Amino acid sequence: PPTEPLPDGWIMTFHNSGLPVYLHRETRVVTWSRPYFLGTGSIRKHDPPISSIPCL
Amino acid sequence: PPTEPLPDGWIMTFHNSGLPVYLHRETRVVTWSRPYFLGTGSIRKHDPPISSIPCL
């Protein structure tokens, strides 16, 4: 399956460590795992998109 | 150093897989790594808080 697009307001860049980081520009919030839109999906039970799964 | 608080609008819960997930309630956006407020820090050069570093 293709990489899911980022949700609105987010951008992917690369940190000097060589790892990608994801910035929500307006809130200045960063995460080191690709964020995605859950929508009406179940937070506890949904299957995450492959591009967003962390190690494990 | 203590765990950094989540930014506004975010909540940590646990996915059925046993891993934590972080939900921004209003946008329905999820990430699997703890988000944090970067503020005036440099996106490329800042040192991330320990609780937000992914595997590696």
Side-chain angles (χ1 to χ4, degrees):
Chain A
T3 302
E4 268 270 287
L6 297 177
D8 297 351
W10 293 87
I11 190 169
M12 177 188 177
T13 187
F14 269 83
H15 183 260
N16 280 355
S17 67
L19 290 168
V21 285
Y22 304 86
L23 167 66
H24 186 267
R25 305 172 42 256
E26 291 174 7
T27 54
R28 291 293 282 180
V29 167
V30 175
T31 179
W32 291 62
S33 287
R34 189 181 182 91
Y36 59 99
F37 180 64
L38 175 63
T40 61
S42 156
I43 180 76
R44 290 174 62 259
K45 301 189 289 192
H46 80 289
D47 294 322
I50 169 63
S51 46
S52 290
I53 298 176
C55 304
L56 280 112
Chain B
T3 302
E4 268 270 287
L6 297 177
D8 297 351
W10 293 87
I11 190 169
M12 177 188 177
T13 187
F14 269 83
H15 183 260
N16 280 355
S17 67
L19 290 168
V21 285
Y22 304 86
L23 167 66
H24 186 267
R25 305 172 42 256
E26 291 174 7
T27 54
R28 291 293 282 180
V29 167
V30 175
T31 179
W32 291 62
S33 287
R34 189 181 182 91
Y36 59 99
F37 180 64
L38 175 63
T40 61
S42 156
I43 180 76
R44 290 174 62 259
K45 301 189 289 192
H46 80 289
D47 294 322
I50 169 63
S51 46
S52 290
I53 298 176
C55 304
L56 280 112

